[PDB]
Amino acid sequence: TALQQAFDTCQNNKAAWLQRKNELAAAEQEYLRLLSGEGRNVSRLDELRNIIEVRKWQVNQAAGRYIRSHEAVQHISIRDRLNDFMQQHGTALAAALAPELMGYSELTAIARNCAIQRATDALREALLSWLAKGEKINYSAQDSDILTTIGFRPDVASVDDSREKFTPAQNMIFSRKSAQLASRQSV
Amino acid sequence: TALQQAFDTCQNNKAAWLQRKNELAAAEQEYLRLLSGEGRNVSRLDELRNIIEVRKWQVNQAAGRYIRSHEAVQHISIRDRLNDFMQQHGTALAAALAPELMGYSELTAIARNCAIQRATDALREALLSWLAKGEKINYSAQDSDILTTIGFRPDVASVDDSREKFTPAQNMIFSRKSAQLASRQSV
């Protein structure tokens, strides 16, 4: 059930990021409209700029969180698929890799590491050889629907909104300003 | 037929290494027998020491070549076994790795390399788990005989006879000395 909770937390993160983007766009269009207005409202313009900055930071944080959650869902799905696949074909896979994998239970640390790295890049070469053909890859039947719903890759909006990087001091100041803004808006 | 060629090359290299070892042992025994004698034979002792050094260098070269050929034949066997195993189970393996390897036919270089790396350490984790359960690994039935004859690892004598690490200068000096020794033996 870990896959299901990963999936619906990813969906919640997506919904939160969409809400953040929507409210940021609403604030931006309101600020532009007040710029077009005749009224000066200098204090209103400054506070709107502050709101725009803090909500852009919130959108960036939400996009980063959603991207991380999506990557976690993909990683756990990969882990489970390798698990049940190789429970299926472990004997054959080890037979294909016996000269580097036999005696693993008693080999020393350096020998174990070198053997697993040799098996590793042998597997990498095999994957390259298969991908050279260009066969179409379909999803696992057991977990196809969840991974199709989350998509192969996050949207370009997610990666671009998360492109901006913030220093820890910027992170704490933006968190404090966002908390203050939320408290003020609630009251 | 490449596997058979590598196997017989490894066998020939092992035979040559054994021949060099027995020649060096005979030279050492004869040198000790002369040294234990009351005769001086200073020139004889010096030329025997030269022959001993030449034989030791030849033994090192033969052991290194034999180890390299054994590694090569093991690598070829692994490549062929993993190739036909993955030709058998490619659909299932790609389905297990579907959420991460799609689009390889047209993705950019950096994305392709990162996807290959992520699939690679996912496979590493799966193989590590299998080694954790501890089921005994057997050689592939198609080429079990060759892999058993060549052994799981090269002989420890070849392992500790190839730790001299001669410098290139010493390498061609010993090559010239060995050629001169062969010419003198012909005389």
Query: What is the full DSSP assignment across B37-84?
Result: SS---HHHHHHHHHHHHHHHHHHHHHHHHHHHHHHHHHHHHHHHHHHH
Token pair for residue A108?
A: 């020393």
Chain A contacts of B104, Cβ < 8 Å? 131
Query: Could you give the CA distance from residue B2 to residue A160 in angstroms, rounded to a whole number?
Result: 51
Per-residue DSSP letter, B141: S
Spell A58-76 as b/e; 16+ CB within 10 A means b. bbbbbbbbbbebbeebbeb
Searching chain B, which residue's CA lies closest to the CA of residue A111?
B153
Q: Which of A123, A67, A66 is nearest to A93 (CA)?
A: A123
Distances (CA, A) of A18 to A11, A92, B134: 11, 47, 47
DSSP of chain A: -HHHHHHHHHHHHHHHHHHHHHHHHHHHHHHHHHHHSS---HHHHHHHHHHHHHHHHHHHHHHHHHHHHHHHHHHHHHHHHHHHHHHHHHHHHHHHTHHHHTTTTT--HHHHHHHHHHHHHHHHHHHHHHHHH-PPP---STTHHHHHHH-SS--HHHHHHTT----HHHHHHHHHHHHHHHHHHH-
Chain A contacts of B102, Cβ < 8 Å? 137, 152
Q: Provide the angle, in degrees to the nearest 10, between the axes of the packed helices B42-96 and B2-36.
A: 150
A173 in contact with chain B, both atoms CB, cutoff 8 A: no
Kindly tell me the burial class for residue A166, based on how many C-beta atoms sit within 10 Å of its own C-beta (0-12, 13-18, 19 or more). middle
Distance of CA A19 to the CA centre of its chain: 18
Distance of CA A169 to the CA centre of its chain: 24
Q: How many CA atoms lie within 13 A of B31 on its CB side?
A: 18
Helix/strand/coil percentages in chain B, nearest 5:
80, 0, 20
Q: Alpha-carbon dihedral of residues A137, A142, A146, A148, nearest 10 degrees? A: 20
Q: Which of A92, A118, A84 is nearest to B84 (CA)?
A: A92
Q: How many CA atoms lie within 13 A of A158 on its CB side?
A: 22
Q: How many CB atoms lie within 10 A of CB B127?
A: 22
Q: Which of A84, A130, A98 is nearest to B81 (CA)?
A: A98
Interface test with B, best of A7, A74, A81, A87 (most B CBs within 10 A): A81
A185 in contact with chain B, both atoms CB, cutoff 8 A: no
Out of B86, B98, B147, name the one closest to residue A126 (CB). Answer: B86
Per-residue DSSP letter, B4: H
Q: How many CB atoms lie within 10 A of CB A179?
A: 11
Resolution given for this structure, in angstroms: 3.0
Tell me how the structure was determined: cryo-EM
The answer to whether A135 touches B94, Cβ cutoff 8 Å, is yes
The answer to whether B137 touches A101, Cβ cutoff 8 Å, is yes
Contacts of B160 (CB under 8 A, 6+ apart): none
Per-residue DSSP letter, B163: -
A110 in contact with chain B, both atoms CB, cutoff 8 A: no
Q: Which of A56, A44, A72 is nearest to A162 (CA)?
A: A56
The radius of gyration of chain B from alpha carbons, rounded to an integer in Å, stands at 25
Token pair for residue A33?
A: 């409209």
The answer to whether A123 touches B82, Cβ cutoff 8 Å, is yes
Query: Could you give the CA distance from residue A106 to residue B80 in angstroms, rounded to a whole number?
Result: 26
Chain B contacts of A70, Cβ < 8 Å? none
Q: Which of A152, A145, A140, A166 is nearest to A70 (CA)?
A: A152
Q: Provide the angle, in degrees to the nearest 10, between the axes of the packed helices A42-96 and A2-36.
A: 150
Searching chain A, which residue's CA lies closest to the CA of residue B151?
A99
Query: Could you give the CA distance from residue A57 to residue A49 in angstroms, rounded to a whole number?
Result: 12
Kindly tell me the burial class for residue B71, based on how many C-beta atoms sit within 10 Å of its own C-beta (0-12, 13-18, 19 or more). middle
B78 in contact with chain A, both atoms CB, cutoff 8 A: yes
Query: Could you give the CA distance from residue A6 to residue A18 in angstroms, rounded to a whole number?
Result: 18
Q: Angle at CA B130, nearest 5°, toward B124 and B138?
A: 110
Kindly tell me the burial class for residue A99, based on how many C-beta atoms sit within 10 Å of its own C-beta (0-12, 13-18, 19 or more). buried
Query: Could you give the CA distance from residue B79 to residue B76 in angstroms, rounded to a whole number?
Result: 5
Give residue for tokens 């659909």: B91
Q: Terminal CA-to-CA distance of chain B, rounded, Å?
A: 42
Q: Terminal CA-to-CA distance of chain A, rounded, Å?
A: 40
Q: Angle at CA B45, nearest 5°, toward B41 and B50?
A: 150
Instruction: State whether A81 and B95 contact (CB < 8 Å).
Output: yes
Q: Which of A147, A155, A87 is nearest to B100 (CA)?
A: A147
Q: Length of chain B in residues, anyone? A: 187
The answer to whether A153 touches B103, Cβ cutoff 8 Å, is no
Distances (CA, A) of B101 to B83, B97, B117, B128: 18, 6, 10, 21
The answer to whether B55 touches B49, Cβ cutoff 8 Å, is no
* Domain range list for chain A: 1-187
Report the topology of domain B1-187: Methane Monooxygenase Hydroxylase; Chain G, domain 1 (1.20.58)
Interface test with A, best of B107, B118, B128, B130 (most A CBs within 10 A): B130
Task: State which amino acid sits at residue A51.
Answer: I
